[PDB]
């Protein structure tokens, strides 16, 4: 009913705009410092997504929860190509792509998330942010792909890979077909 409610909001939380700046294990590049190999905010998202995704609204508390939006929905954004990766090998391609393919942003209308996140009131709020996401996105690709699978030595996992369009609030960041 609570999540595995996030212990990784920290006093350490500076911000870029609305949302956290912290030393955290993201394996790729952006303006976050790092940490040990750990079951961190992205397992509070992932290992317990087998708690989280079945919710359809939630007791947020802060900036890092506003951030955890992505850290948990981007799980089901991966599942929209993992099904085509019915052998991991295709995902062993996309482990280039994720940190390449960066998401839509504040100060854009039509992008709805200015309901929570802060516009680039200066442009720096984008400049720092943009790099800030790349890390996270390929961090997710890596951690998922290496935890879950080997091409067909292991296998896909529909018994939770089915959560692909059955999301928290049944909402999404972006990617509706595949």
């Amino acid at each position: 009913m609570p999540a595995y409610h996030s212990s990784l909001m920290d006093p350490d939380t500076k911000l870029i705009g609305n949302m956290a700046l912290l030393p955290i294990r993201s394996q790729f590049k952006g303006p976050a410092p790092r940490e040990t190999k750990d079951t961190d905010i992205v397992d509070e998202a992932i290992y317990y997504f087998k708690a989280n995704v079945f919710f359809k609204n939630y007791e947020i508390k802060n900036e890092a929860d506003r951030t955890l939006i992505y850290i948990t929905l981007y799980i089901s954004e991966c599942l929209k190509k993992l099904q085509k990766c019915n052998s991991k090998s295709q995902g062993e391609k996309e482990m280039y792509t994720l940190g390449i393919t960066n998401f839509p942003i504040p100060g854009e209308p039509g992008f709805p998330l200015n309901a929570i996140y802060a516009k680039p009131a200066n442009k720096q709020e984008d400049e720092v942010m943009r790099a800030y996401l790349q890390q996270l996105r390929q961090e997710t690709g890596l951690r998922l792909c290496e935890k879950v699978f080997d091409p067909q030595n292991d296998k896909p996992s529909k018994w939770w890979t089915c959560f692909v369009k059955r999301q928290f609030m049944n909402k999404s960041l972006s990617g509706p077909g595949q």
Partner: peptide, 13 residues
């Protein structure tokens, strides 16, 4: 602030 919508609406700033 907390939570009400469950949907992509509002964009309020």
């Amino acid at each position: 602030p907390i939570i009400r919508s469950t949907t992509k609406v509002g964009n309020i700033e």
